[PDB]
């Protein structure tokens, strides 16, 4: 919609489009249109500084990014003070912005210090768990972190995101996440069995399908999953792979119960 | 404290004056108060220049908010009513410096001064100065009263005087700028009414103000080159009147000429022809007259800026004058006009020779640099001539040599004999100015720095620079020579004879050369660790002694600063010594001078950065200490540095969410700072810390943590007696009781 109607539009409404257009462009990954949409936003607004900082980080202009982050903080002081005066509940929205700005600061020191990566990942994992369990905040935070980390490099965060989506009536989004975690679309290739790499993803996918109408298919798939797990456990037993074994056994139990509960 | 300060401020009363003011500011920074106020009274009543200096300098240096205003307001009010001019300039500067304090009295003070200035409008000029100073220093409360301002200035302006006009037009300019940022018809009406010599040079400046504010583009050229609806509607009438006045009054009447020269280019920039040939005639006629020769070229250049495609016809005339004026060496503006002309390449070639025949003069090299900037083409001939003239100057008066050394580093150039000539130069030199500039030029000209040719020359020259930088009897060029060595020099500073000299440089007296040398050596030691490492270990041992075994408040602070620098640079030497150092620093914090605490807190943050996941187990105590300091302003350390160090700890070590549970008041504290202070840095640091700790779920926050009631069904007769008793008993508990 944004692409279709750009020259057919007035400047006043162009300004209001710019933010959503830039957000969509960032989400898709087309960096050409993101700059065009960003340059239209006023420079005095918090969002303008935020998006200019994002672009600067993408283009490795760290000093400019720091300047933009500082300016964004100065622009945020007013809203935070206004809302903080009454109750902590009303101030949460700005607290999320403060969280995002600090995470953006920490994004630098990830492109410069290779010896400081695992600690940053652990810190991110521990901090994300103290926030509220809304979906949009998680979406924003994960989008911010996605500048240097791909989903395949940290599975548990995305698995928890998919599980959170599941308990809400948004099963399609969880389907998309699990599809982009498996690497293929088992929905298209019905005649084929599920892939066996990353068993946790397969387990989560089977219970999402059970959440939908495909109950008997889920049961049939789970039986084969258990058979394959037992065969793999027997054929790949080694003293080195004991922790693995311990994590394998703990998985099989969780499978078995489900079977019975479904039977 | 009493007599010494009195003597110092008397010497101030009786270049040198500015140095004395700076020295007084430094002495106050080191710091009696009653004697200082008595001294201010002593010098005020009597001389006035030093009193103004003393009064003005201390403002913005000490922490006086209200009593200082209450005392100095009378001093400033006594002088303005009746007094001689000129000296007022400094009193006005003092007023401006005072007015930027802003402690709950600016509105009253400024309105009082403005009203008393309007009353007068040695009396009128004082009011003009007061209005101008209040407009500059206080845009807010000056904007409060505008109609009386305009009405009374329109009366006082048109008196037969020049001094009162020169300030009235400036006050009008300030008021109109403030009005535009957030009257014009009245201004134009009263300006045109008078014209129908006294009622010329003020009306012209007022119309200039209106025209300039109408289009800021022309003034954005005027200002830049100097350093090197309403009017539009009534455009035809004003243009016709101005043209008639110019054509008719050819020799009717200095001041009018400068006003005309000021107006012509801005008017042309408003609309680039109608009277171009006429403007050419006026300006050129004004040139040959010495009293107007300086301003005539200003007008010519400004009009060349305004009018673009019609000035070229008169290139031969102006140039004919220029080549005649310089051979003897007014042209200071000629060069600005020539530079503005390009904003045209073959005439500059011929113009090259006499500009360089001028010798060394200010604004020439900058003019050439800007010319090369806008039009990239002819430069090699410029460089050749410049180098030849510089050589002729340096083979053989003092300020000329200084300017030559300054010029020898500007823009590109195309040098073996020159370096050795400079070696002779700074050697024949008992002068803080010649030597400093020569050393700067030598440092800049050796920018290139793997081939073993010119390496020997670099070695010899660098040896000489180090010798001078370490042996200078005075301190001010040692600091410049040392600082001139940046990160680029690593190959030659890794030698032995140079490292020994650098070591000698350490343990100096000024403490600034000490910081610079320790920073430099710390930057080194990644290339020649054989020599630097033991020396730094020894210096670390010495630093930990001074701080531990000396009961003095100055050396401890200096040593803490030197430890902070050492930790920041060369961090591979500190990792095995983390536990001892920390244990020492904490001891200084656990004691029943603010600088010592500030430096200790500052260095703890750098210690935190250099480590992490190894400073855990030490976070709880440092968290208790800094929290105790954050509240409880009895131990009033700074807050910016404390918040900075807290954030550094949390970020580096990794400590999230748990602090909220362990210290339930950490959130109620951090938000309060947002509604109580007026510092950008403090607020930004608080926001950064809130971000680093992470957003917390409101439910988790919850987990972590009568008169109307009297009105029931009681009759009114019984209600009145009670509430009265409740209120009285509420008062009846100490405090206010003091007088009640």
PDB file of C-alpha atoms in Angstrom, chain B residues 449-717:
ATOM      1  CA  UNK B 449      55.768   8.467   8.590  1.00  0.00           C
ATOM      2  CA  UNK B 450      58.404   1.454   5.215  1.00  0.00           C
ATOM      3  CA  UNK B 451      61.577   2.804   3.607  1.00  0.00           C
ATOM      4  CA  UNK B 452      64.965   3.698   5.094  1.00  0.00           C
ATOM      5  CA  UNK B 453      65.217   7.056   3.325  1.00  0.00           C
ATOM      6  CA  UNK B 454      64.323  10.274   5.162  1.00  0.00           C
ATOM      7  CA  UNK B 455      64.349   7.982   8.229  1.00  0.00           C
ATOM      8  CA  UNK B 456      67.689   9.452   9.322  1.00  0.00           C
ATOM      9  CA  UNK B 457      66.373  12.997   8.859  1.00  0.00           C
ATOM     10  CA  UNK B 458      63.287  12.075  10.886  1.00  0.00           C
ATOM     11  CA  UNK B 459      65.501  10.613  13.616  1.00  0.00           C
ATOM     12  CA  UNK B 460      67.685  13.714  13.870  1.00  0.00           C
ATOM     13  CA  UNK B 461      64.762  16.140  13.857  1.00  0.00           C
ATOM     14  CA  UNK B 462      62.797  14.109  16.408  1.00  0.00           C
ATOM     15  CA  UNK B 463      65.854  13.958  18.657  1.00  0.00           C
ATOM     16  CA  UNK B 464      66.069  17.749  18.511  1.00  0.00           C
ATOM     17  CA  UNK B 465      62.344  18.145  19.239  1.00  0.00           C
ATOM     18  CA  UNK B 466      62.559  15.824  22.247  1.00  0.00           C
ATOM     19  CA  UNK B 467      65.632  17.687  23.504  1.00  0.00           C
ATOM     20  CA  UNK B 468      63.859  21.047  23.338  1.00  0.00           C
ATOM     21  CA  UNK B 469      60.641  19.648  24.800  1.00  0.00           C
ATOM     22  CA  UNK B 470      62.454  18.214  27.810  1.00  0.00           C
ATOM     23  CA  UNK B 471      65.031  21.050  28.334  1.00  0.00           C
ATOM     24  CA  UNK B 472      62.805  24.173  27.798  1.00  0.00           C
ATOM     25  CA  UNK B 473      63.262  26.394  30.942  1.00  0.00           C
ATOM     26  CA  UNK B 474      59.637  27.578  30.736  1.00  0.00           C
ATOM     27  CA  UNK B 475      56.596  25.266  30.846  1.00  0.00           C
ATOM     28  CA  UNK B 476      54.300  26.525  28.104  1.00  0.00           C
ATOM     29  CA  UNK B 477      56.149  25.212  25.038  1.00  0.00           C
ATOM     30  CA  UNK B 478      57.047  21.912  26.713  1.00  0.00           C
ATOM     31  CA  UNK B 479      53.288  21.152  26.913  1.00  0.00           C
ATOM     32  CA  UNK B 480      52.818  22.014  23.198  1.00  0.00           C
ATOM     33  CA  UNK B 481      55.841  20.051  21.976  1.00  0.00           C
ATOM     34  CA  UNK B 482      54.830  16.983  23.987  1.00  0.00           C
ATOM     35  CA  UNK B 483      51.195  17.171  22.851  1.00  0.00           C
ATOM     36  CA  UNK B 484      52.230  17.579  19.203  1.00  0.00           C
ATOM     37  CA  UNK B 485      53.192  13.875  19.177  1.00  0.00           C
ATOM     38  CA  UNK B 486      50.055  11.892  18.306  1.00  0.00           C
ATOM     39  CA  UNK B 487      49.342   8.202  17.706  1.00  0.00           C
ATOM     40  CA  UNK B 488      51.080   8.347  14.312  1.00  0.00           C
ATOM     41  CA  UNK B 489      54.580   8.323  15.861  1.00  0.00           C
ATOM     42  CA  UNK B 490      55.322   4.778  17.032  1.00  0.00           C
ATOM     43  CA  UNK B 491      58.342   3.586  15.050  1.00  0.00           C
ATOM     44  CA  UNK B 492      60.756   6.258  16.296  1.00  0.00           C
ATOM     45  CA  UNK B 493      59.442   6.469  19.874  1.00  0.00           C
ATOM     46  CA  UNK B 494      60.195   2.755  20.396  1.00  0.00           C
ATOM     47  CA  UNK B 495      63.937   3.503  20.414  1.00  0.00           C
ATOM     48  CA  UNK B 496      66.044   3.534  23.599  1.00  0.00           C
ATOM     49  CA  UNK B 497      67.532   7.044  23.715  1.00  0.00           C
ATOM     50  CA  UNK B 498      63.998   8.426  23.240  1.00  0.00           C
ATOM     51  CA  UNK B 499      62.292   6.148  25.766  1.00  0.00           C
ATOM     52  CA  UNK B 500      64.845   7.171  28.396  1.00  0.00           C
ATOM     53  CA  UNK B 501      64.093  10.842  27.719  1.00  0.00           C
ATOM     54  CA  UNK B 502      60.360  10.143  27.958  1.00  0.00           C
ATOM     55  CA  UNK B 503      60.942   8.420  31.302  1.00  0.00           C
ATOM     56  CA  UNK B 504      62.878  11.491  32.440  1.00  0.00           C
ATOM     57  CA  UNK B 505      59.898  13.629  31.423  1.00  0.00           C
ATOM     58  CA  UNK B 506      57.816  11.784  34.015  1.00  0.00           C
ATOM     59  CA  UNK B 507      57.925  12.904  37.654  1.00  0.00           C
ATOM     60  CA  UNK B 508      57.653  16.547  36.598  1.00  0.00           C
ATOM     61  CA  UNK B 509      56.193  19.431  38.606  1.00  0.00           C
ATOM     62  CA  UNK B 510      53.307  20.837  36.540  1.00  0.00           C
ATOM     63  CA  UNK B 511      51.349  17.532  36.720  1.00  0.00           C
ATOM     64  CA  UNK B 512      49.915  18.171  33.242  1.00  0.00           C
ATOM     65  CA  UNK B 513      53.080  17.133  31.459  1.00  0.00           C
ATOM     66  CA  UNK B 514      52.879  14.226  33.908  1.00  0.00           C
ATOM     67  CA  UNK B 515      49.422  13.176  32.709  1.00  0.00           C
ATOM     68  CA  UNK B 516      50.449  13.623  29.076  1.00  0.00           C
ATOM     69  CA  UNK B 517      53.648  11.586  29.441  1.00  0.00           C
ATOM     70  CA  UNK B 518      51.969   8.764  31.362  1.00  0.00           C
ATOM     71  CA  UNK B 519      49.246   8.602  28.707  1.00  0.00           C
ATOM     72  CA  UNK B 520      51.848   8.490  25.924  1.00  0.00           C
ATOM     73  CA  UNK B 521      53.891   5.739  27.577  1.00  0.00           C
ATOM     74  CA  UNK B 522      50.729   3.758  28.294  1.00  0.00           C
ATOM     75  CA  UNK B 523      49.794   4.068  24.630  1.00  0.00           C
ATOM     76  CA  UNK B 524      53.222   2.558  23.995  1.00  0.00           C
ATOM     77  CA  UNK B 525      54.387  -0.717  25.647  1.00  0.00           C
ATOM     78  CA  UNK B 526      52.577  -2.855  23.047  1.00  0.00           C
ATOM     79  CA  UNK B 527      55.673  -2.633  20.805  1.00  0.00           C
ATOM     80  CA  UNK B 528      58.640  -2.608  23.224  1.00  0.00           C
ATOM     81  CA  UNK B 529      57.344  -4.363  26.363  1.00  0.00           C
ATOM     82  CA  UNK B 530      60.916  -5.089  27.490  1.00  0.00           C
ATOM     83  CA  UNK B 531      61.428  -1.574  28.898  1.00  0.00           C
ATOM     84  CA  UNK B 532      58.001  -0.108  29.665  1.00  0.00           C
ATOM     85  CA  UNK B 533      56.489  -2.861  31.817  1.00  0.00           C
ATOM     86  CA  UNK B 534      58.857  -2.802  34.849  1.00  0.00           C
ATOM     87  CA  UNK B 535      58.871   0.999  34.849  1.00  0.00           C
ATOM     88  CA  UNK B 536      55.074   1.087  34.968  1.00  0.00           C
ATOM     89  CA  UNK B 537      55.067  -1.499  37.765  1.00  0.00           C
ATOM     90  CA  UNK B 538      57.447   0.677  39.795  1.00  0.00           C
ATOM     91  CA  UNK B 539      55.306   3.762  39.186  1.00  0.00           C
ATOM     92  CA  UNK B 540      52.203   1.828  40.249  1.00  0.00           C
ATOM     93  CA  UNK B 541      53.930   0.863  43.502  1.00  0.00           C
ATOM     94  CA  UNK B 542      54.881   4.494  44.123  1.00  0.00           C
ATOM     95  CA  UNK B 543      51.342   5.713  43.402  1.00  0.00           C
ATOM     96  CA  UNK B 544      49.783   3.213  45.823  1.00  0.00           C
ATOM     97  CA  UNK B 545      52.194   4.521  48.535  1.00  0.00           C
ATOM     98  CA  UNK B 546      51.475   8.296  48.265  1.00  0.00           C
ATOM     99  CA  UNK B 547      47.719   7.564  48.512  1.00  0.00           C
ATOM    100  CA  UNK B 548      48.143   5.155  51.481  1.00  0.00           C
ATOM    101  CA  UNK B 549      50.844   6.893  53.528  1.00  0.00           C
ATOM    102  CA  UNK B 550      50.182  10.630  53.208  1.00  0.00           C
ATOM    103  CA  UNK B 551      47.575  12.649  55.089  1.00  0.00           C
ATOM    104  CA  UNK B 552      47.295  15.474  52.548  1.00  0.00           C
ATOM    105  CA  UNK B 553      44.293  16.371  50.413  1.00  0.00           C
ATOM    106  CA  UNK B 554      46.074  17.439  47.211  1.00  0.00           C
ATOM    107  CA  UNK B 555      48.655  14.735  46.491  1.00  0.00           C
ATOM    108  CA  UNK B 556      46.034  12.051  47.141  1.00  0.00           C
ATOM    109  CA  UNK B 557      43.747  13.550  44.490  1.00  0.00           C
ATOM    110  CA  UNK B 558      46.587  13.958  41.994  1.00  0.00           C
ATOM    111  CA  UNK B 559      47.714  10.364  42.549  1.00  0.00           C
ATOM    112  CA  UNK B 560      44.142   9.122  42.119  1.00  0.00           C
ATOM    113  CA  UNK B 561      43.943  10.934  38.778  1.00  0.00           C
ATOM    114  CA  UNK B 562      47.324   9.432  37.726  1.00  0.00           C
ATOM    115  CA  UNK B 563      46.042   5.952  38.726  1.00  0.00           C
ATOM    116  CA  UNK B 564      42.911   6.468  36.649  1.00  0.00           C
ATOM    117  CA  UNK B 565      44.991   7.381  33.611  1.00  0.00           C
ATOM    118  CA  UNK B 566      47.307   4.404  34.140  1.00  0.00           C
ATOM    119  CA  UNK B 567      44.372   1.999  34.436  1.00  0.00           C
ATOM    120  CA  UNK B 568      42.743   3.443  31.317  1.00  0.00           C
ATOM    121  CA  UNK B 569      45.910   3.035  29.240  1.00  0.00           C
ATOM    122  CA  UNK B 570      47.875  -0.207  28.878  1.00  0.00           C
ATOM    123  CA  UNK B 571      45.376  -2.490  30.670  1.00  0.00           C
ATOM    124  CA  UNK B 572      47.429  -5.698  30.378  1.00  0.00           C
ATOM    125  CA  UNK B 573      49.502  -4.564  33.391  1.00  0.00           C
ATOM    126  CA  UNK B 574      46.548  -4.277  35.793  1.00  0.00           C
ATOM    127  CA  UNK B 575      44.734  -7.622  35.452  1.00  0.00           C
ATOM    128  CA  UNK B 576      46.980  -9.518  37.939  1.00  0.00           C
ATOM    129  CA  UNK B 577      46.674  -6.597  40.412  1.00  0.00           C
ATOM    130  CA  UNK B 578      42.898  -6.121  40.448  1.00  0.00           C
ATOM    131  CA  UNK B 579      42.198  -7.402  43.967  1.00  0.00           C
ATOM    132  CA  UNK B 580      44.835  -5.287  45.793  1.00  0.00           C
ATOM    133  CA  UNK B 581      44.053  -2.016  44.017  1.00  0.00           C
ATOM    134  CA  UNK B 582      40.312  -2.344  44.589  1.00  0.00           C
ATOM    135  CA  UNK B 583      40.797  -3.142  48.277  1.00  0.00           C
ATOM    136  CA  UNK B 584      42.787   0.078  48.631  1.00  0.00           C
ATOM    137  CA  UNK B 585      40.262   2.287  46.849  1.00  0.00           C
ATOM    138  CA  UNK B 586      37.287   1.030  48.858  1.00  0.00           C
ATOM    139  CA  UNK B 587      39.119   1.992  52.047  1.00  0.00           C
ATOM    140  CA  UNK B 588      39.190   5.646  50.994  1.00  0.00           C
ATOM    141  CA  UNK B 589      35.426   5.481  50.426  1.00  0.00           C
ATOM    142  CA  UNK B 590      34.807   3.956  53.882  1.00  0.00           C
ATOM    143  CA  UNK B 591      35.816   6.942  55.996  1.00  0.00           C
ATOM    144  CA  UNK B 592      33.774   8.914  58.563  1.00  0.00           C
ATOM    145  CA  UNK B 593      37.699  17.077  50.153  1.00  0.00           C
ATOM    146  CA  UNK B 594      35.256  16.252  47.322  1.00  0.00           C
ATOM    147  CA  UNK B 595      37.868  15.877  44.593  1.00  0.00           C
ATOM    148  CA  UNK B 596      39.375  12.759  46.160  1.00  0.00           C
ATOM    149  CA  UNK B 597      35.997  11.009  46.243  1.00  0.00           C
ATOM    150  CA  UNK B 598      35.206  12.145  42.701  1.00  0.00           C
ATOM    151  CA  UNK B 599      38.474  10.781  41.310  1.00  0.00           C
ATOM    152  CA  UNK B 600      38.113   7.501  43.215  1.00  0.00           C
ATOM    153  CA  UNK B 601      34.633   6.993  41.779  1.00  0.00           C
ATOM    154  CA  UNK B 602      35.880   7.919  38.306  1.00  0.00           C
ATOM    155  CA  UNK B 603      38.701   5.361  38.420  1.00  0.00           C
ATOM    156  CA  UNK B 604      36.447   2.585  39.726  1.00  0.00           C
ATOM    157  CA  UNK B 605      34.471   2.814  36.480  1.00  0.00           C
ATOM    158  CA  UNK B 606      37.570   2.319  34.347  1.00  0.00           C
ATOM    159  CA  UNK B 607      38.526  -0.631  36.542  1.00  0.00           C
ATOM    160  CA  UNK B 608      35.065  -2.046  35.856  1.00  0.00           C
ATOM    161  CA  UNK B 609      35.504  -1.582  32.101  1.00  0.00           C
ATOM    162  CA  UNK B 610      38.924  -3.252  32.011  1.00  0.00           C
ATOM    163  CA  UNK B 611      37.409  -6.337  33.683  1.00  0.00           C
ATOM    164  CA  UNK B 612      34.058  -8.094  34.039  1.00  0.00           C
ATOM    165  CA  UNK B 613      32.754 -11.459  35.257  1.00  0.00           C
ATOM    166  CA  UNK B 614      35.838 -11.081  37.504  1.00  0.00           C
ATOM    167  CA  UNK B 615      34.598  -8.032  39.480  1.00  0.00           C
ATOM    168  CA  UNK B 616      31.452  -9.893  40.575  1.00  0.00           C
ATOM    169  CA  UNK B 617      31.497 -10.738  44.348  1.00  0.00           C
ATOM    170  CA  UNK B 618      32.505  -7.056  44.761  1.00  0.00           C
ATOM    171  CA  UNK B 619      29.291  -5.555  43.286  1.00  0.00           C
ATOM    172  CA  UNK B 620      27.101  -5.849  46.417  1.00  0.00           C
ATOM    173  CA  UNK B 621      29.332  -3.702  48.632  1.00  0.00           C
ATOM    174  CA  UNK B 622      29.994  -1.080  45.911  1.00  0.00           C
ATOM    175  CA  UNK B 623      26.160  -1.097  45.367  1.00  0.00           C
ATOM    176  CA  UNK B 624      25.431  -0.467  49.077  1.00  0.00           C
ATOM    177  CA  UNK B 625      28.021   2.322  49.234  1.00  0.00           C
ATOM    178  CA  UNK B 626      26.853   4.153  46.112  1.00  0.00           C
ATOM    179  CA  UNK B 627      23.210   3.803  47.132  1.00  0.00           C
ATOM    180  CA  UNK B 628      23.960   5.282  50.553  1.00  0.00           C
ATOM    181  CA  UNK B 629      25.682   8.182  48.803  1.00  0.00           C
ATOM    182  CA  UNK B 630      22.852   8.687  46.287  1.00  0.00           C
ATOM    183  CA  UNK B 631      20.357   9.672  48.970  1.00  0.00           C
ATOM    184  CA  UNK B 632      21.513  11.404  52.164  1.00  0.00           C
ATOM    185  CA  UNK B 633      22.847  14.671  50.772  1.00  0.00           C
ATOM    186  CA  UNK B 634      24.861  15.071  54.003  1.00  0.00           C
ATOM    187  CA  UNK B 635      27.603  13.180  52.130  1.00  0.00           C
ATOM    188  CA  UNK B 636      26.999  15.438  49.130  1.00  0.00           C
ATOM    189  CA  UNK B 637      29.314  14.045  46.496  1.00  0.00           C
ATOM    190  CA  UNK B 638      28.416  14.541  42.843  1.00  0.00           C
ATOM    191  CA  UNK B 639      25.548  12.621  41.242  1.00  0.00           C
ATOM    192  CA  UNK B 640      26.622  12.589  37.582  1.00  0.00           C
ATOM    193  CA  UNK B 641      29.765  10.583  38.329  1.00  0.00           C
ATOM    194  CA  UNK B 642      27.997   8.277  40.792  1.00  0.00           C
ATOM    195  CA  UNK B 643      25.296   7.416  38.256  1.00  0.00           C
ATOM    196  CA  UNK B 644      27.945   6.962  35.560  1.00  0.00           C
ATOM    197  CA  UNK B 645      29.904   4.484  37.687  1.00  0.00           C
ATOM    198  CA  UNK B 646      26.747   2.610  38.695  1.00  0.00           C
ATOM    199  CA  UNK B 647      25.819   2.224  35.038  1.00  0.00           C
ATOM    200  CA  UNK B 648      29.338   1.101  34.169  1.00  0.00           C
ATOM    201  CA  UNK B 649      29.256  -1.581  36.869  1.00  0.00           C
ATOM    202  CA  UNK B 650      25.837  -2.861  35.813  1.00  0.00           C
ATOM    203  CA  UNK B 651      26.768  -2.931  32.126  1.00  0.00           C
ATOM    204  CA  UNK B 652      30.225  -4.484  32.430  1.00  0.00           C
ATOM    205  CA  UNK B 653      29.648  -7.149  35.073  1.00  0.00           C
ATOM    206  CA  UNK B 654      26.120  -8.197  34.108  1.00  0.00           C
ATOM    207  CA  UNK B 655      23.590  -7.635  36.879  1.00  0.00           C
ATOM    208  CA  UNK B 656      19.918  -7.306  35.947  1.00  0.00           C
ATOM    209  CA  UNK B 657      16.487  -7.536  37.572  1.00  0.00           C
ATOM    210  CA  UNK B 658      17.891  -8.823  40.864  1.00  0.00           C
ATOM    211  CA  UNK B 659      18.836  -5.309  42.114  1.00  0.00           C
ATOM    212  CA  UNK B 660      15.156  -4.329  42.084  1.00  0.00           C
ATOM    213  CA  UNK B 661      14.358  -7.180  44.474  1.00  0.00           C
ATOM    214  CA  UNK B 662      17.438  -6.690  46.658  1.00  0.00           C
ATOM    215  CA  UNK B 663      17.080  -2.887  46.990  1.00  0.00           C
ATOM    216  CA  UNK B 664      13.342  -2.176  46.746  1.00  0.00           C
ATOM    217  CA  UNK B 665      13.791   1.625  46.821  1.00  0.00           C
ATOM    218  CA  UNK B 666      16.202   1.802  43.805  1.00  0.00           C
ATOM    219  CA  UNK B 667      13.271   2.566  41.398  1.00  0.00           C
ATOM    220  CA  UNK B 668      11.459   5.155  43.565  1.00  0.00           C
ATOM    221  CA  UNK B 669      14.811   6.926  43.802  1.00  0.00           C
ATOM    222  CA  UNK B 670      15.805   6.898  40.144  1.00  0.00           C
ATOM    223  CA  UNK B 671      12.508   8.393  38.974  1.00  0.00           C
ATOM    224  CA  UNK B 672      12.588  11.222  41.528  1.00  0.00           C
ATOM    225  CA  UNK B 673      15.724  12.647  39.908  1.00  0.00           C
ATOM    226  CA  UNK B 674      13.651  13.301  36.778  1.00  0.00           C
ATOM    227  CA  UNK B 675      11.312  15.721  38.601  1.00  0.00           C
ATOM    228  CA  UNK B 676      13.823  17.543  40.828  1.00  0.00           C
ATOM    229  CA  UNK B 677      16.930  18.604  38.849  1.00  0.00           C
ATOM    230  CA  UNK B 678      17.813  20.824  35.886  1.00  0.00           C
ATOM    231  CA  UNK B 679      20.868  19.088  34.406  1.00  0.00           C
ATOM    232  CA  UNK B 680      21.041  17.477  30.977  1.00  0.00           C
ATOM    233  CA  UNK B 681      23.856  15.149  32.012  1.00  0.00           C
ATOM    234  CA  UNK B 682      22.204  13.952  35.212  1.00  0.00           C
ATOM    235  CA  UNK B 683      18.866  13.280  33.508  1.00  0.00           C
ATOM    236  CA  UNK B 684      20.536  11.468  30.610  1.00  0.00           C
ATOM    237  CA  UNK B 685      22.561   9.325  33.018  1.00  0.00           C
ATOM    238  CA  UNK B 686      19.427   8.458  34.993  1.00  0.00           C
ATOM    239  CA  UNK B 687      17.628   7.435  31.799  1.00  0.00           C
ATOM    240  CA  UNK B 688      20.629   5.364  30.707  1.00  0.00           C
ATOM    241  CA  UNK B 689      20.747   3.548  34.051  1.00  0.00           C
ATOM    242  CA  UNK B 690      17.004   2.879  33.904  1.00  0.00           C
ATOM    243  CA  UNK B 691      17.503   1.414  30.439  1.00  0.00           C
ATOM    244  CA  UNK B 692      20.439  -0.761  31.471  1.00  0.00           C
ATOM    245  CA  UNK B 693      18.603  -2.219  34.464  1.00  0.00           C
ATOM    246  CA  UNK B 694      15.767  -3.183  32.120  1.00  0.00           C
ATOM    247  CA  UNK B 695      12.025  -2.624  32.069  1.00  0.00           C
ATOM    248  CA  UNK B 696      10.175  -4.280  34.951  1.00  0.00           C
ATOM    249  CA  UNK B 697       6.667  -5.722  34.921  1.00  0.00           C
ATOM    250  CA  UNK B 698       4.321  -3.563  37.056  1.00  0.00           C
ATOM    251  CA  UNK B 699       3.045  -6.618  38.950  1.00  0.00           C
ATOM    252  CA  UNK B 700       6.618  -7.485  39.930  1.00  0.00           C
ATOM    253  CA  UNK B 701       7.021  -3.873  41.057  1.00  0.00           C
ATOM    254  CA  UNK B 702       3.947  -4.234  43.270  1.00  0.00           C
ATOM    255  CA  UNK B 703       5.236  -7.509  44.723  1.00  0.00           C
ATOM    256  CA  UNK B 704       8.643  -5.989  45.480  1.00  0.00           C
ATOM    257  CA  UNK B 705       7.130  -3.106  47.458  1.00  0.00           C
ATOM    258  CA  UNK B 706     -10.409  13.217  58.005  1.00  0.00           C
ATOM    259  CA  UNK B 707     -12.556  16.416  57.987  1.00  0.00           C
ATOM    260  CA  UNK B 708     -14.569  14.871  55.134  1.00  0.00           C
ATOM    261  CA  UNK B 709     -14.391  11.529  56.992  1.00  0.00           C
ATOM    262  CA  UNK B 710     -15.694  13.500  60.028  1.00  0.00           C
ATOM    263  CA  UNK B 711     -18.827  14.521  58.058  1.00  0.00           C
ATOM    264  CA  UNK B 712     -21.262  11.657  58.833  1.00  0.00           C
ATOM    265  CA  UNK B 713     -24.700  12.516  60.301  1.00  0.00           C
ATOM    266  CA  UNK B 714     -23.542  14.804  63.181  1.00  0.00           C
ATOM    267  CA  UNK B 715     -25.528  18.118  63.408  1.00  0.00           C
ATOM    268  CA  UNK B 716     -23.699  21.287  62.241  1.00  0.00           C
ATOM    269  CA  UNK B 717     -23.646  22.678  65.831  1.00  0.00           C
TER     270      UNK B 717
END
